[PDB]
Design an enzyme around this catalytic site. Structure first.
Site, PDB file in Angstrom:
ATOM      1  N   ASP A  92     138.730  44.122  16.135  1.00 37.83           N
ATOM      2  CA  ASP A  92     139.894  44.767  16.054  1.00 37.83           C
ATOM      3  C   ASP A  92     139.502  44.070  14.351  1.00 37.83           C
ATOM      4  OD1 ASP A  92     142.415  45.941  15.242  1.00 37.83           O
ATOM      5  OD2 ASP A  92     143.299  45.081  16.804  1.00 37.83           O
ATOM      6  N   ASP A 121     142.855  48.257   9.334  1.00 40.48           N
ATOM      7  CA  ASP A 121     142.478  48.234  10.406  1.00 40.48           C
ATOM      8  C   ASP A 121     141.920  49.139  12.072  1.00 40.48           C
ATOM      9  OD1 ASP A 121     143.101  48.018  13.229  1.00 40.48           O
ATOM     10  OD2 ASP A 121     145.420  48.026  13.349  1.00 40.48           O
TER      11      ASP A 121
END
Ligand SMILES: CCC1(CC)CC(=O)N([C@@H]2CCOc3ccc(C(=O)N[C@H]4CC(C)(C)Oc5ccccc54)cc32)C(=N)N1
Ligand SMILES: *[C@@H]1O[C@H](CO)[C@@H](O)[C@H](O)[C@H]1NC(C)=O
EC number: 3.4.23.-
Length: 338
Positions: free
Chosen positions: A33, A224
């Site tokens: 992430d 992201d």
């Protein structure tokens, strides 16, 4: 020296890779992430059903695990769920590279605290953890984030990584310390990171077809990997839903129905990054939907637009370059291969 970490695209939206924790080592398959920095691992202290269905790391079976003192369990609440747990340190290994004494979060509950009546992301996925790849500003606890600690213990690795996303084959790969021309076609365009918390670069203009929807206030793009969809602020979302409606469709006629849909153009000074209708429309059940959701990243007067994995990285190879003294922090974008 450069190495890579292949990623398995799961039935849920997840792209998970192999991560080894503790001594003797236990295997977990977290996601990677760029929108958080903590390391979360699902543990046996979480006895919830959404936890019991996955591989759980047991700190009691780790000779190198150390428990860190905290006054309370750290609680992370976000859009689709909540992670809660304690913190400790242990020794990690990723792609045969060693990271010792790394602080991480031990998942002990996945109960949703937005609306405790259902709708929890962890019921619909096989979640085993998160390896945060953001900047140290978002670290919730510990002396040093994971990636920085990896570099401090592997000084011949260059502070950068990149993501090749191809969900149809099994060639999805995370590469650490470099890139490979075996993934992108053309050149790599660099964009300066101006806010070292997320991987956040300035967005200059945004067009939905010919309609200019941005920008009159200071806007930013966040890269992201930890979201499937792209996002827009609430204000632009009301406009977005009037220009791009979701429709019924099938696998047979979807190329035909999206023939009229507009091109989405992200403008970064000189660089124009276009999204074609077949690259941002998702097909689930019998409905063609825009792969976009509504996120207002909290800030006084800044507006953040997120670029997710399913909608952006599937088509654009993305490089993340950590700043040092001989260079600044940037992200690189190139077209992906077939
Ligand atoms: C991972 C969550 C966090 C870190 C705690 C926090 C966080 O909210 N975001 C973004 C930014 C804000 O908007 C959203 C909105 C929604 C989602 C979401 O539901 N993501 C799914 C994707 C999937 C199913 C592949 O895997 C997992 C695995 C675990 C959790 C969620 C997912 C993510 C974000 C992160 N980037 N990271
Ligand atoms: C590991 O990190 C902790 C910080 O949580 C620090 O106090 C300790 O000195 C470090 N080294 C070892 C060998 O524990």
């Amino acid at each position: 020296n450069i190495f890579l970490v292949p990623l398995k695209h799961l039935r849920d939206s997840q792209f998970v890779g192999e991560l080894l924790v503790g001594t003797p080592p236990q295997t977990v398959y977290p996601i990677f992430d760029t929108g958080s920095t903590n390391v979360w691992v699902v543990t046996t202290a979480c006895e919830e059903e959404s936890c019991k269905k996955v591989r759980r790391y047991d700190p009691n079976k780790s000779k190198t695990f150390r428990r860190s003192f905290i006054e309370k369990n750290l609680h992370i609440v976000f859009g689709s769920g909540s992670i809660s747990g304690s913190v400790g340190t242990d020794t990690f290994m990723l792609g045969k590279h060693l990271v010792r004494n790394q602080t991480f979060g031990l998942v002990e509950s996945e109960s949703n605290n937005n609306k405790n009546g259902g709708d929890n992301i962890f019921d619909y996925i096989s979640f085993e953890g998160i390896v945060g790849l953001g900047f140290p500003g978002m670290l919730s606890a510990g002396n040093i984030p994971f990636f920085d600690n990896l570099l401090k213990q592997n000084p011949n690795v260059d502070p950068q990584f990149s993501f090749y996303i191809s969900p149809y084959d099994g060639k999805s790969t995370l590469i650490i310390g470099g890139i490979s021309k075996s993934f992108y076609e053309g050149d790599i365009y660099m964009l300066p990171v101006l806010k070292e918390s997320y991987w956040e670069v300035k967005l200059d203009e945004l067009y939905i077809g010919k309609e200019r929807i941005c920008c009159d206030e200071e806007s930013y793009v966040i890269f992201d990997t930890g979201t499937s969809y792209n996002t827009m602020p609430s204000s632009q979302m009301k406009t977005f839903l009037n220009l791009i409606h979701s429709t019924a469709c099938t696998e047979q006629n979807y190329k035909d129905i999206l023939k009229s849909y507009p091109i989405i153009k992200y403008v970064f000074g000189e660089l124009i990054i276009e999204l074609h209708p077949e690259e941002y429309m998702i097909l689930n059940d019998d409905v063609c939907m825009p792969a976009y959701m509504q996120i207002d990243v909290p800030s006084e007067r800044n507006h953040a637009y997120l670029l997710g994995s399913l909608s952006f990285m599937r088509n654009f190879f993305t490089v993340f370059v950590r700043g040092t003294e001989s260079r600044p922090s940037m992200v690189g974008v190139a077209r992906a291969k077939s």
